[PDB]
Symmetry: D2
Subunit: 363 residues, 4 copies
C-alpha cells in the first residue's frame, strides 16, 4: 500500500539530521508514516517465544497526534495488529515518530537507553494478583520480540537462512558467513541490491527467501529480485520483483537504467555458464564503485548439462573461466574496473572500482 518512491524518500530523509526528520514529517501525512513504520516493524520482529498470547501496544506520537497499534504476540503466529479488546495488554511501548524513524531507517550510533517509553501492564483490582502470574513472563517475552523489531540490530544471516527457508546455509551450502563478512559494512547505507533468481522456479507459491534475508540484513535498503517466472506474490515493503531473462543483455541494461545503480548484484539464477557470463558483462557496468558482484554455484562449470566441461582446463566458456580472467584483469570496461576477487566454495565476490592505482613509468 506504500509508494516505493515515497518509501525510498522516507529512508533517505531518516538518515539525515534534525532538519531532514522535520522535513520528512511535514512532507508526508504522519498517520501514513506510522502505518509504514508498523509494516516495517512487523517484518523485522523475530518469531515470538511466549506460550500465552499477549498484546503489546505500540504508540507512535507526533506533536498532538497519537497513533495506537495493538499487536498480538504468540508463538507460532507472526505478530499482527488486532483490536484492543482481543487480549491482555502486557506492555505499552511509546515512540516519538522521528525517534522511531531514526531507530528503523536512520544513520545512528547504538543507543542502549532513552529511545522510547515503556509502561508495564498499562490497563491493569480483583484479578490484579492472578493476572500477574499468568501474563508476567509472556509480557516480558512478547515485549522483547516487539522491541527487537523496533531497531536496527544486525541479524545472524545463518539463522535468517533457516527462518526464511533459503539454502544459503545449513545443508547444501555454507555461504552466509562469507556474505556477512562482505556485506555487513554496507548496513548503514541506503543500498540497492539486485539478486538474480528469486527461487521456487515454476511453482506458484515458493520463493523469495533470500530477498527477505537481504531486506532484513539491510535496514535502509531496497531489494530487487529478477526471475524468469512471475514472482509478484513475493513483493512487499522494500522488496520488488522483476520478471525477465538474465540471458537478455539488452533487457538487463534497461532495468539497470531504471532501478540502478546497484551497490550489490548477486547471481543465483539458472546456473547456466553462458547466463552467468552474459549477466556479468551486462550488469558489472551498473555496479557502483566500491560495490560488489556476487556469483553463486560455480559448481555447474564442470557439468555439460549447464554448458560446462568436466575437464577443469577446458574453462573458456565457464563461470570459472570468467573468474580466472578476472584475475588477469586485476593484474575492456571490466579490466579497468576490478580491484578484488574473493573465491570460496561455490561463491565468488567481485569488487568494483578503478584499477588504476600504483602506476609507474614503464621505462
Amino acid at each position: 500500500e506504500f509508494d516505493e518512491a515515497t518509501v525510498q524518500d522516507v529512508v533517505r530523509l531518516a538518515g539525515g539530521h534534525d532538519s531532514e526528520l522535520r522535513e520528512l514529517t511535514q512532507k508526508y501525512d504522519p498517520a501514513m508514516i506510522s502505518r509504514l513504520l508498523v509494516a516495517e516493524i512487523l517484518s523485522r520482529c523475530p518469531p515470538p517465544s511466549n506460550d500465552t498470547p499477549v498484546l503489546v501496544e505500540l504508540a507512535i506520537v507526533h506533536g498532538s497526534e497519537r497513533f495506537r497499534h495493538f499487536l498480538r504476540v504468540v508463538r507460532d503466529s507472526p505478530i499482527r495488529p488486532v483490536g484492543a479488546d482481543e487480549g491482555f495488554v502486557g506492555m505499552l511501548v511509546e515512540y516519538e515518530l522521528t525517534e522511531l524513524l531514526r531507530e528503523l531507517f536512520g544513520v545512528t550510533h547504538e543507543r542502549p537507553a532513552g529511545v522510547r517509553g515503556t509502561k508495564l501492564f498499562p490497563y491493569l483490582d480483583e484479578e490484579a494478583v492472578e493476572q500477574i502470574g499468568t501474563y508476567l513472563l509472556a509480557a516480558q517475552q512478547g515485549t522483547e520480540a516487539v522491541l527487537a523489531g523496533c531497531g536496527s540490530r544486525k541479524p545472524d544471516l545463518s539463522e535468517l537462512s533457516s527462518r526464511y527457508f533459503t539454502p544459503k546455509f545449513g545443508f547444501l551450502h555454507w555461504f552466509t558467513p562469507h556474505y556477512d563478512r562482505h556485506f555487513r559494512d554496507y548496513r548503514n547505507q541506503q543500498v540497492r541490491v539486485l539478486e538474480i533468481g528469486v527461487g521456487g522456479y515454476k511453482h506458484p507459491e515458493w520463493g523469495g527467501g533470500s530477498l527477505r534475508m537481504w531486506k532484513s540484513f539491510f535496514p535502509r535498503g531496497q531489494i530487487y529480485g529478477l526471475d524468469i517466472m512471475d514472482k509478484s506474490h513475493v513483493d512487499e515493503l522494500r522488496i520488488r520483483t522483476i520478471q525477465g531473462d538474465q540471458n537478455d543483455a539488452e533487457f538487463l541494461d534497461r532495468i539497470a537504467r531504471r532501478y540502478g545503480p546497484f551497490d550489490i548484484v548477486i547471481d543465483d539464477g539458472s546456473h547456466i555458464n553462458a547466463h552467468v557470463r552474459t549477466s556479468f558483462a551486462a550488469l558489472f557496468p551498473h555496479v557502483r564503485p566500491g560495490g560488489l558482484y556476487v556469483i553463486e554455484d560455480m559448481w555447474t562449470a564442470y557439468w555439460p548439462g549447464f554448458g560446462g566441461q568436466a575437464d577443469p582446463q577446458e574453462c573458456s566458456g565457464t563461470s570459472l573461466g570468467l573468474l580466472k580472467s578476472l584475475i588477469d584483469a586485476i593484474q575492456g570496461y571490466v579490466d579497468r574496473n576490478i580491484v578484488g576477487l574473493h573465491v570460496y566454495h561455490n561463491v565468488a565476490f567481485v569488487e568494483k572500482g578503478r584499477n588504476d592505482e600504483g602506476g609507474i613509468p614503464t621505462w
Copy 2:
C-alpha cells in the same frame, strides 16, 4: 562430572598456540576432552526451530581415534545425546579435537570456513521420500548445532527471555548496558561473581543470569552467591556458593578461594547496608581493568530495604555510595592535607557509569595526579596567567 580445576586448565591451554593445544591433548585423555566439549556444546546451542526431529552426528577426531556423538535436535526440546539408531541422521559434522577446542575455548579470529567437515544425509543410500521429510529439518538442526560449536556473541536481550531472568523486557532494561561494558572481555578467561542466583527460597527456581553470563563469556568461569542452597544450578563453568553477602569475612574467604574477579555483580537482597558491605569487601578483589556492577538501586528510597524516601538523606544508601564514588574519582583534587590520606576506594576508581537501576564501577589505579600548584586557584588569576 568434570573437575573445575581441569575445565579451567583446558580453557587456559585452548587459548594458546599450537604447542599449547598439543600439550592439552597429551595431558588429558582425548575421550574425556571430547565429552567435556560436547557438554559445553549442549549448553551453547540455541533453541532449534525444526518441527521434525533429526539427529546431527558430531564426530570428534584425534589421531587414530574417532569419538561419535549423536545429537537429537527438535523444537521445544533441549538438544541431547542419544544412540545412533534413535533418529534419522540428517548431517555428519566432523571436527579435529584441537580445532573444536580453538573454536569453543580459543582466542581466535572469525573463521567463516575450513573449521570442520560436513556430510549431508551421511547414511542415506540413493532415499527420495527422505528428502521431502528431512531436508529442511536437517538444515535447521545442523544450523543450531553449528552455532553451538562456535564462539559467536549472543544477544543478551534474547538470552534474558530464553533463561527467564528479569534483566530485560518487562521490569528492567539492563542488557544493552551490560553488552556495551562486557563485550570487550569475551576473549578473556574471565572470572565472574554474581551475588543473587535467583529463586529465593523456592526449591527449583534460579540461575538464569548465571546461564546468561556463561553463554556470553565462552572462556569464563561463573560464580553465583546466594543465601539459599543453589546446588541444582551448578553445571560446566557454573558454580554456586552458599553464603551471606553481608558477611565480610565470608566474602573475603570466597574471594581468596575463587578470585580475583574481572567482574562482580550485586543483584542480591538489595538491602542498602548489604550493597555497601559487599562493595567494601569485594572491590579489592576486582582485577585492575575490571568492573563492579550494582543492580536495583531503587531500594535506596525505601525504608523496608534500609533506604530513605528523601533522596538527600542518602548517607546510608546505595546512591549515597555512588555519589561518594564521584568524590573518590576526584580525590586528588582536594586541597593539601597532611592529616587526611586517601582510602582504598579513592586510589582504585577510574570510572563510574550510572543508568536506571544499574551502575558500573571501573577498577584501576587512580593516580593521574591532581591539578599542579602553579595553576592559579581563582578565575581571574587563571585568565591573566593564560594570556
Copy 3:
C-alpha cells in the same frame, strides 16, 4: 570566505546520500566550486608531512570532460599549500572522480582499501640522463608526500591523542588524560552530520591563541559543523566547518537564543570559565537543546573544590558545585523510583537523562527519554515481604 555555511552543510548532507544525491549535488552546484571546497577541506585534513625534500603531489579532480588540477607542495614543517605546476618536482599524480572524492570526505561509506582513486608515480619524468639521479633524489619524498595527501583525502578515524598534540590542546599528555574517554564516547558519531558546541574556545585574553580543541573536533567529525562559544572574540579561528560565537556562558537567554539558531546539538562540551555557577547555568539552559541520544560534557570539575571558582573545600558542601550537579543527576536518573507524591512533578532533566559517566576531571551526560517506568506498586517494599512473594510458597 567563499564557502557559505549553509552551502557546506548542504554539500555534506548530499554527500551522505546514494547516487541520486551525489548527482543532485553536482547539478545544484558548480563542479569547479565544489572541487575548490573539497581541496580547502583536504588541506585542513592532511597530517604533518615527514619528507625532507619538497615534492609536488598533483591532485586532479575529474568531472565529466572537466579536469581540475591542483599542485600541492608537500614538505616537513610547512602547511601543504597549492602552488603553480612548474614550482617543483611532481612526485605523484593523484586522480579522483569528483563524486568519489565527495563520498570519501563527506559521505557515509564502508572501508575501501582500493578502487577510489588513480595514481601515477613521476608522471612527467622524461627518460633522460638526469632521470636516474632524479629518481634517487625524489623516490622516498614522493611516497611520503603522497601518504600525507591521501590521508587528507579520506575519512579514516584519527588518533585523538595525536590531534591533541598536533593542535596544541591540553586534553591529553600532561595535565589531562581525556582523549581516550572522548574517543570512547565520540567515535560512534563519526558517520553523522553532527553539530558540536564547545563552550570555551581557548587563549582567553590573548588575541592570537585558541581554537585548538575546535580544530580537533573538525578533524574527528568529518561530516560535522563545529561551534565555539567564548566571551572574547575568536573570529580569527573561523574556517570551513568551524564557527565561533561571542557571548557569556552565564547568560541563559542568550544561550537559548543561539541554541535555537544553530541547534539542536548532538554534543555540547563545557570547557569554559570553570566557575561552578556558570557550569550549572549552562547545563540547565543547554541540556534541553541536546538531541535525544546526544551528549553533554563537563570538563575540569576540579574547581568544585575551590572557592575562587565558587567551589567548596569540603566535598560534602556541594549544593552549588559542578560535582553537586553530577550528584543530583544520579537522583534525576532514579526519579521514577521515588515514592508517589501528588505535589511533586518530575523536572525537565529528570525526564531527559538516561546515563552518567564520570571520569577524572571529565563527565558525560546522556540525553534521552527517561521513561522506563519505576518498580510497580505490587512489588513488595521491604526485603522480608519480597522473599515471601518471590519464593512461590
Copy 4:
C-alpha cells in the same frame, strides 16, 4: 640479549589470567622481565616530535622492587636509556610489572584509564627558579610523554605510516588485523630488514621469522629471528617449518620459485592461517589453479583421481593488484549431491513441486 624461548614463554603467560601473570613473575627474575619490557617499549615508540630534549622516567614496580629507567626523548633521534643527570625529567610514569606485561603482551580489552600512575615534573622543587623551566619544558614534556605512552600499549598502528618509517598495505591491514591479539608465528621469504620490523610492530604478541639466502643476523632483535638458507631447497623449507612453525601467516615475495615454496610451505600454515603471494606469469598460473582446488569437490567422480593436499586444504582466495591471500583450512563441505540433477531443465522440474 634475551633468550627466544623465554620471550615466547613470557608472551604466552602474559596472555593469561592473574594466575599466569603471577606464575610468570615467580618463574623469572623481575629485573630481567623489566629489561625485556623496556626493550619492547623502545621498538614500539613512534618518532618523537619535541624540539626541546626531555627525559621521561619509566618506573616499573614489583613488590619491594622498583626499576627506574630514564629515557631521552627528542625529535630526529631514537628513544634510548640515559642517566638521571643527562637531562630534565619532565614526567614520571609508573607501572605495576604485571600491568605492563598485560598492556604490552596481554589479551586485554581497551583500558582508557587506570593502567599506570603519572607525576608531572617529579623533581622540580622551589617556586622562584621553577617558573623558568615550566615555560620551556611544558610543551616538550607533553609531546615526550605522549611518544613513550604510545609505546607502552598495544594500539593498532597504521601500516602506511610504518612503511615510510622503515624506509598495497590496506589489503594487508584488512586480512591481518584480526590476528593481532594472537601469539602468531609469521614467516617472510625474502629479506635492511624494514618489513620484518613492520610485522613485529603490527603483531604485538608475535614471533617473526625472515628467510634469506644472505646472512642477515644483524637484523635480529627481540621477536625477530632471521634464517639463512636456500628457499629453492624444498627439504630445507620443510625442515625449518617443522623447527619454527607451524605458521599463522607465510609471506612469499615472488618478484625476486613460488610454486616450489608454496607446495613446501602451505602444509605448515595453520588451519585458519594465511599464505600470502606478492607478485610473475608462474605466480598467476598458480592463483588460477587455486580456484579449481577450492572447487575440487564439484568434479565428476573418478576412481583414478584423488584430491591433492592443496585441494583438501584451501578454503578461500583473495586476489588484489600485486598481492593474493590464500586461506588455509579444511575444504570438506561436500560437493553437490548426486540426486541434484546435472542439467538445467531437469533441475527446474525437480524443484518446481509440480
